[PDB]
Amino acid sequence: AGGGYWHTSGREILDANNVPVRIAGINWFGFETCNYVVHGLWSRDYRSMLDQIKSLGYNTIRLPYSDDILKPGTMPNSINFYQMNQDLQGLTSLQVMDKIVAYAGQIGLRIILDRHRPDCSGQSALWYTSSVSEATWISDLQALAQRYKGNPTVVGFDLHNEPHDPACWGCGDPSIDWRLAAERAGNAVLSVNPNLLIFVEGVQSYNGDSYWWGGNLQGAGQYPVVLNVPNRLVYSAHDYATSVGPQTWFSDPTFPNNMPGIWNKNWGYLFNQNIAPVWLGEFGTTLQSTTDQTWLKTLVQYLRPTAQYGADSFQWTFWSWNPDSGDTGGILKDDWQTVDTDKDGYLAPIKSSIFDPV
Q1: What sign for the dihedral angle of Cα 197, 54, 104, 237?
Q2: Whose CA is closest to 35, among 75, 87, 67, 1?
Q3: Which of 101, 262, 285, 330 is most deeply buried (CB count within 10 A of its CB)?
Q4: Sign (positive/negative) of CA torsion 357, 336, 316, 133?
């Protein structure tokens, strides 16, 4: 399954033949760093990396980027070309991206593009900065959509990674109201290719409740995102455990009984109420603490195991493939070859199936 562009039906995603599909994937980061390319291509051929990811079961890649790679002539600076990656030599960051998108499509993976940073120096709480403007943001998103227009390997865009304070949901002040910005961006995108899915994260705070960045969708119920094209909107949250940082509820004595409550309040409800599909776009942990391990165990059940519920379940993409994330660690170990199969162990129940070749 997975052929052609995709669409929504209630809380499910469907391919072009109206078969339900489940996004159950991984984050491979680096094109949003100042290396301007996915990491680990200093040790691995990229096709070999992609094959390993498929082999392990992940069917979708969330591909973080920054707007720096759209500056003309921007080039990767951490690729090894000895006996590997030979066809990437002399390519721009964008030419390299082309390459990754194609092989991945050829082998049954899918790609979601993620405006993860305005520039390679770091994330922004708002969708714009003094240096990178909304207009540039939007032009870039359109530039990328036009660039993959016709290749359903890229199924849609995560408009902006992890909006947070002082972003607001529905407050009406156009300088900080992410709900309105999201529509601006989204319709710009669908104006180029109306078959793409639009993934919108939450903010961090709402009606005095605060959650993880990009995780708070509590205001989406009353102030929904409305796009020019129907059946394109996927809401998305992020969630973490203590390896990333401290939250009141890990200390709650009834943990992790509390968790589904917190999840449902912040993003769960949209799925339970059948309003829209929901994507846990980013989540992970080093699994160093018992707490984190209960968390992951619990979370995985919450997301609805594929065997009991199939594609009528939460979409997800784990953080991350890369071992070089302090806070979470990765699927691969420091050698960029050896799998942390125990970690991979946890995600088994919610994995699903590779898609059809594009």
Answers
A1: positive
A2: 75
A3: 330
A4: negative
Query: Which of 100, 187, 102 is closest to 151 using CA atoms?
Result: 102
Alpha-carbon distance values, 309 to 20, 144, 306, 314, 321 (Å): 12, 34, 5, 10, 26
The method recorded for this entry reads: X-ray
SS3 (DSSP) at 291: helix
Query: CB of 196 within 8 A of CB of 188?
Result: no
CA dist., res. 231 & res. 236, Å (int) = 15
CA angle 58, 247, 61 (to 5 degrees): 15
Residue 28 and residue 35 in contact, taking contact as beta carbons nearer than 8 Å = no
d(CA 286, CA 288): 5
The token pair that represents 243 in the structure block: 């390896």
Q: How many residues does the chain have?
A: 358
Look at residues 234, 99, 87, 96 and name the one whose alpha carbon lies nearest to residue 153. Answer: 99
How do 205-206 and 209-210 pair as beta strands? antiparallel
Residues catalogued as catalytic: 162, 282
Q: How far is CA 314 from CA 23, 35, 126, 131, 348, in A?
A: 8, 32, 26, 36, 14
With a CB cutoff of 8 Å and minimum separation 6, the contacts of 320 are: 26, 27, 28, 29, 284, 328, 330, 331
Q: Are 235 and 284 within 8 A, CB to CB?
A: no
Q: Return the CATH fold of 1-358.
A: TIM Barrel (3.20.20)
Cα distance between residue 92 and residue 69, in whole Å: 8
Q: What is the resolution of this structure in A?
A: 2.4
> What are 308's two structure tokens?
């009991």
CA 162/CA 127 separation, integer angstroms:
9
